[PDB]
Amino acid sequence: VVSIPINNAGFEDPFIEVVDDYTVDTPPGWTTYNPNNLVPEKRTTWTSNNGVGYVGPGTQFYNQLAPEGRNIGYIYLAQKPGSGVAGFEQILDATLEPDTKYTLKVDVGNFGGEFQKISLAGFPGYRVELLAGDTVLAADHNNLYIKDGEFKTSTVTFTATPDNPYLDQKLGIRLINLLQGTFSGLDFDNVRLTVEPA
């Protein structure tokens, strides 16, 4: 069982000091997957955005601490349900290899609480995908039920045979806000990808 390197895999970069403070720029090491242009290049707290957030004692948004370390990565979409999807993507160094089983695990978070008078109850739905090149090899499209203010672990697996047409292409990961519900924000954390003989 081997780990494949992922940059900023727990969104711990940058370090954030204050409880529930967050960034509004793409997490370091990741790019914004934006197939529908929902996330503007220059964002504010009133636009769709993504970034990292510190989950600590005193958080008003969760009933538990970050799955890993201090921070989570979050994606919030302001457009109405059905408008499209957005999230994070990272292209890895490793390439697809035959006779190997891949295991992608990532923690998915559903916001909780209330701010002002508005509640964060609700979830847009998630999809976690494992890629080779531009191809989605395997994906978990919203299979887990996650309660408000909680996290749960998603597992995606894929076995690559010697005749798989995408061998030698770069592995990739996408973490996606499906925007099929409100509250239309979600979190991810603790991304891990391992390989083993198949």
- 136 bridge partner residues: 131
Number of residues that bind its own copies (CB under 8 A): 32
Measure the CA–CA gap between 125 and 147, rounded to whole angstroms.
Answer: 12
Residue 14 touches its own copies, criterion: CB under 8 A: no
Residue 168 Cβ vs its own copies, minimum distance, rounded to whole Å: 15
Furthest-apart CA atoms within the chain: distance in Å: 56
Amino acid at 190: N
Residue 89 touches its own copies, criterion: CB under 8 A: no
**Which is nearest to 101 in space by CA: 7, 3, 195?**
195
Stretch of 17-25, 64-72, 90-98, 132-140 contacting its own copies, by CB under 8 A? 132-140
Question: Quick one: what does residue 145 bind among its own copies, Ca ion, none, with the CB cut-off 5 to 8 Å set by partner type?
Answer: its own copies
Site string for its own copies, 18-47 (x = CB under 8 A): ------------------------------
**Which is nearest to 195 in space by CA: 122, 126, 94?**
94
Amino acid at 108: V
Tokens of 67: 């799955």
Stretch of 4-12, 37-45, 69-77, 158-166 contacting its own copies, by CB under 8 A? 158-166
Site string for Ca ion, 75-114 (x = CB under 5 A): ------------------------------------x---
Query: What part of residues 109-128 is at the interface with its own copies (CB under 8 A)?
Result: 121-123, 125
Residue 152 touches its own copies, criterion: CB under 8 A: no
**Which is nearest to 39 in space by CA: 185, 187, 191, 149?**
185
Q: Which residue do the tokens 């900023």 mark?
A: 8
Cβ contact 78:141 at 8 Å? no
User: Residue positions in the annotated binding site?
Assistant: 10, 12, 21-22, 41, 68, 71, 110-111, 120, 122, 134, 148, 151, 189
